[PDB]
Amino acid sequence: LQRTLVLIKPDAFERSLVAEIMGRIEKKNFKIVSMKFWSKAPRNLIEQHYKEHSEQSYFNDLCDFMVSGPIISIVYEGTDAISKIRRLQGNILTPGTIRGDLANDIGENLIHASDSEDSAVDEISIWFPE
Amino acid sequence: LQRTLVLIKPDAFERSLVAEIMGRIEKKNFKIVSMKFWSKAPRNLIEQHYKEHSEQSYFNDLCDFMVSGPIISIVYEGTDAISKIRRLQGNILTPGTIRGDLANDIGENLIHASDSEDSAVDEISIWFPE
Amino acid sequence: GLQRTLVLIKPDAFERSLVAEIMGRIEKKNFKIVSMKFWSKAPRNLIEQHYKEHSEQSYFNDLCDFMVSGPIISIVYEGTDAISKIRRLQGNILTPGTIRGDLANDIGENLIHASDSEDSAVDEISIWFPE
Amino acid sequence: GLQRTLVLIKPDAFERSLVAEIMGRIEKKNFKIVSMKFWSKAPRNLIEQHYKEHSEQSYFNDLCDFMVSGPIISIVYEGTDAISKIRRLQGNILTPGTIRGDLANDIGENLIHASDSEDSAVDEISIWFPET
Amino acid sequence: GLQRTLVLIKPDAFERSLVAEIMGRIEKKNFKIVSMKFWSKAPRNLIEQHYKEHSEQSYFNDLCDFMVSGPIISIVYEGTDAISKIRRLQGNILTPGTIRGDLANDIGENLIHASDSEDSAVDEISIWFPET
Amino acid sequence: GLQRTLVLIKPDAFERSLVAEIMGRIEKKNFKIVSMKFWSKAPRNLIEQHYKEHSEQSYFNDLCDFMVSGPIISIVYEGTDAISKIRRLQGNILTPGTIRGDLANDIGENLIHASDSEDSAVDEISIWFPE
Ligand SMILES: Cc1cn([C@H]2C[C@H](O)[C@@H](COP(=O)(O)OP(=O)(O)O)O2)c(=O)[nH]c1=O
Ligand SMILES: Cc1cn([C@H]2C[C@H](O)[C@@H](COP(=O)(O)OP(=O)(O)O)O2)c(=O)[nH]c1=O
Ligand SMILES: Cc1cn([C@H]2C[C@H](O)[C@@H](COP(=O)(O)OP(=O)(O)O)O2)c(=O)[nH]c1=O
Ligand SMILES: Cc1cn([C@H]2C[C@H](O)[C@@H](COP(=O)(O)OP(=O)(O)O)O2)c(=O)[nH]c1=O
Ligand SMILES: Cc1cn([C@H]2C[C@H](O)[C@@H](COP(=O)(O)OP(=O)(O)O)O2)c(=O)[nH]c1=O
Ligand SMILES: Cc1cn([C@H]2C[C@H](O)[C@@H](COP(=O)(O)OP(=O)(O)O)O2)c(=O)[nH]c1=O
Ligand SMILES: [Mg+2]
Ligand SMILES: [Mg+2]
Ligand SMILES: [Mg+2]
Ligand SMILES: [Mg+2]
Ligand SMILES: [Mg+2]
Ligand SMILES: [Mg+2]
Numbered sequence A, B: 001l002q003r004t005l006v007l008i009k010p011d012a013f014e015r016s017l018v019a020e021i022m023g024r025i026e027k028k029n030f031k032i033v034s035m036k037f038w039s040k041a042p043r044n045l046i047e048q049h050y051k052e053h054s055e056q057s058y059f060n061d062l063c064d065f066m067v068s069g070p071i072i073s074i075v076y077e078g079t080d081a082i083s084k085i086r087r088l089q090g091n092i093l094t095p096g097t098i099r100g101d102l103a104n105d106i107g108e109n110l111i112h113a114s115d116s117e118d119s120a121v122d123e124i125s126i127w128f129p130e
Numbered sequence C, F: 001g002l003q004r005t006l007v008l009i010k011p012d013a014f015e016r017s018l019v020a021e022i023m024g025r026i027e028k029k030n031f032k033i034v035s036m037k038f039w040s041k042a043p044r045n046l047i048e049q050h051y052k053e054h055s056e057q058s059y060f061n062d063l064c065d066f067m068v069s070g071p072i073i074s075i076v077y078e079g080t081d082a083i084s085k086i087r088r089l090q091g092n093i094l095t096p097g098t099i100r101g102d103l104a105n106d107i108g109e110n111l112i113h114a115s116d117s118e119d120s121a122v123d124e125i126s127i128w129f130p131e
Numbered sequence D, E: 001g002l003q004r005t006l007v008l009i010k011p012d013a014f015e016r017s018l019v020a021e022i023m024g025r026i027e028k029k030n031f032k033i034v035s036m037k038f039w040s041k042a043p044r045n046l047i048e049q050h051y052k053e054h055s056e057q058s059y060f061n062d063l064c065d066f067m068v069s070g071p072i073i074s075i076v077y078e079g080t081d082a083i084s085k086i087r088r089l090q091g092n093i094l095t096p097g098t099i100r101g102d103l104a105n106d107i108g109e110n111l112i113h114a115s116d117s118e119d120s121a122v123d124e125i126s127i128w129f130p131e132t
Helices: A009-013 A018-027 A045-047 A059-065 A079-090 A097-102 A119-127 B010-014 B016-026 B043-049 B059-065 B079-090 B098-102 B117-127 C011-015 C019-028 C045-051 C060-067 C083-089 C099-101 C117-126 D010-017 D019-028 D044-050 D060-067 D082-090 D099-103 D117-129 E009-013 E018-027 E044-050 E060-067 E084-088 E098-105 E120-130 F011-015 F019-028 F044-051 F060-067 F083-088 F097-104 F118-128
Strands: A004-009 A031-038 A071-078 A111-115 B004-007 B031-038 B069-078 B109-112 C002-009 C033-040 C072-080 C113-115 D002-010 D032-039 D074-081 D113-114 E002-009 E032-039 E072-080 E112-114 F002-009 F030-037 F072-080 F112-114
Touching: A004 A079, A004 A119, A004 F011, A009 A018, A009 D002, A018 A071, A031 C060, A045 A119, A045 E084, A045 F044, A071 A079, A071 A119, A079 A097, A079 A111, A079 B079, A097 F019, B004 B016, B004 B079, B004 B117, B004 C083, B010 B016, B010 E072, B016 B079, B016 B098, B043 B059, B043 B117, B059 B098, B059 C019, B069 B079, B079 B109, B098 C019, B109 D010, C002 C019, C002 C083, C019 C072, C019 C083, C019 C099, C019 E018, C019 F072, C045 C060, C045 C117, C072 C083, C072 C117, C072 D113, C083 C113, C099 D019, D002 D019, D002 D082, D002 D117, D010 D019, D019 D074, D019 D082, D044 D117, D074 D117, D082 D099, D099 F083, D099 F112, E002 E018, E002 E084, E002 E120, E009 E018, E018 E072, E018 E084, E018 F060, E018 F097, E044 E060, E044 E120, E072 E084, E072 E120, E084 E098, E084 E112, E084 E120, F002 F019, F002 F083, F002 F118, F011 F019, F019 F072, F019 F083, F019 F097, F044 F060, F044 F118, F072 F083, F072 F118, F083 F097, F083 F112
Parallel strands: none
Antiparallel strands: A004 A071, A004 A111, A031 A071, A031 B031, B004 B069, B004 B109, B031 B069, C002 C072, C002 C113, C033 C072, C033 E032, D002 D074, D002 D113, D032 D074, D032 F030, E002 E072, E002 E112, E032 E072, F002 F072, F002 F112, F030 F072
């Protein structure tokens, strides 16, 4: 039984897919543990969240995009939660997942889910320092 | 163009209807303006929110219920937003609405939506004092 | 005020693959299945009892003919005020939001029966669930 | 008996990605497609003919500019009582359960048009499918 | 050609209100119901017969106590390649797109059983529908 | 990497009322309709061109027969990497999550065609949209 961090990206709000995305996590029996609405995320928070990528050349376009609209940060709890929600997120190639059914751009891909126990602990501390 | 207050009640979490409910408001083109997750709402907040009802004999069962599980408080924005989201909420008698399609008890009815300009201003100040 | 009502999923439901869709609308309003029977063909006897009140109508035989034209499922549903709330779920072909309102388009081929009163329920339930 | 009626999927439907959602509700009510055309941009005179009863109203020009602001789909549907049944499906932005009731929140950007009468239906059909 | 297979809707499905959701996915894949029974409580020997290949495992008793903890529905489905197609629909809790992949998160509370072979299928069917 | 691909909604789609469901899956993956035509009956000519590569197969005539058995809609879709992504949406009757995976159950009656490569798209698009 784990906790993991999810961000619902601005494009979800654009395309009104917010509930669709959350619904898929709900219908798999994961529980909201805490949650925040950000009309525009503090760019500092975004930069930390993507620190890993600061050296990639796409980094700035990424931060620009993540701050160009609302986002929701969620802490989800459930059995094998990190691994499972990752699979649920999927990729824009494989049907059945969130990115597989709804997303279409390597950049505008609707959702973030932590990919490891370390990044999960880390990403939760970023959005939910308390 | 108005702002209104919505609560998603504990029974929504019980029955995993949270996204279903939010989805219906999203698909009608209303926008999240701000939002809070409460694993257990401060009973003080609940009592204020339902002050109007303190004289009714059902009052305490009501507060007990509203605090027996998570709730989400949302500020929604959109044309005629107060009136419309009210209609959307509906009642447990009329199909097509949230309560009409999903709820079934006069007490456990999934959602709250402000019913007037005054109560809307008031209810937003309660959950979102800033 | 807990109650019980009798529901028939009609042959057009199977024909058109709307069995899950119909039941799911009843399930989402928090009604519980209490008894259920699948009938590949319903005894013309049982049908005529079910629609005994209509025996003196022009449409009585085409009704029966149709009700035996394919499978049907009889369900006993249970929940607060079930008799009347499931009735509103069923609705009519004129009111969007209901089962007939969204999915049906014909006076006769209309997907679902639901008891219209307590007398009818107690009565209908007996027909389909003699036990 | 069988009627035919004319539907237009408006540009807001394409923008908001509700084209399948809309056609879906009509499909699930057991109505069939007889004719269908996709217009990346509907010609302005077609739009102006289609709304000709509206030609004197203040909103007339803005309406047409809107209906021309993006793609539209015109569809002839066939089904029992199609005209009235599909009018009802469309509903309005005050009626939960209908297309405009669940999905629309604007007097002008309301996703869909359907013929409102036997004659307006026959008329509207010849505009979008004159080759008959 | 046509096969028949046996499905069980488990008690977790009734608790979580996913009975229509589950049957729906099989219905949309074009499989037909031939037989169906609702059990408010399935008799324990039926459950124990149904899982008899499992009788030596540690989990055997807990499994049966679970399958008896609430209602279940048994269904015979008919369709082309039904056994394998419906096994695949069920999937597992690691495979998005399937019943267990989208809706389940427990090794035991996994909503649905379907026959996994021609023989297990014929066998399982006589257990729940012995009157044939 | 914007692309265009040709999609056919087959006669089983209409027969079974899955036209909106199919298109909606394409719409939700953010693909845009660029051209569209409804055909109450498709010219056996156009079909045979479309399936010219299969002309030497056992199934070639039943294929054609079926493709003319009811309406079809040809759609030109457009979006990043559309040719290949719509192909994965279409999937096969063995893989849940795809159109065929969820909705189809037959080698032949399988609801939808999508271009399998750029050559096929450019080629197919021409057949159905000569203009
Ligand atoms: C790898 C990669 C990422 N990105 C951007 C878009 C993504 O939203 C974000 C994160 O990408 P990445 O960390 O590779 O994937 P995930 O979202 O599964 O963690 O960085 C690109 O724009 N191009 C790329 O090649
Ligand atoms: C009127 C009423 C309310 N309640 C409880 C349940 C409801 O969640 C809450 C509010 O009821 P009310 O203010 O009447 O309706 P709304 O939710 O539309 O504002 O009070 C009862 O339990 N019984 C009653 O008769
Ligand atoms: C009234 C009527 C009913 N029927 C059929 C379909 C109905 O489900 C059944 C009884 O009709 P009715 O009492 O109108 O509907 P309900 O199912 O709501 O009781 O008989 C007709 O075929 N034609 C008719 O004119
Ligand atoms: C009344 C009205 C309609 N419209 C648009 C949206 C309507 O679909 C169309 C015709 O209006 P109207 O005839 O009132 O609505 P309906 O479409 O139900 O017949 O014109 C406006 O843009 N402004 C307006 O004030
Ligand atoms: C493996 C396993 C199964 N089960 C339950 C859930 C399974 O549906 C059933 C049989 O297990 P198994 O044969 O592994 O799964 P399947 O249902 O895919 O054949 O028993 C447990 O309760 N505990 C376990 O460790
Ligand atoms: C291979 C094959 C195809 N068909 C039909 C249905 C297929 O959609 C069409 C071409 O077959 P195929 O190339 O296998 O499928 P796809 O549609 O993915 O190209 O011909 C058969 O009826 N039987 C067969 O064995
Ligand atoms: Mg990553
Ligand atoms: Mg009130
Ligand atoms: Mg009646
Ligand atoms: Mg009008
Ligand atoms: Mg097995
Ligand atoms: Mg191929």
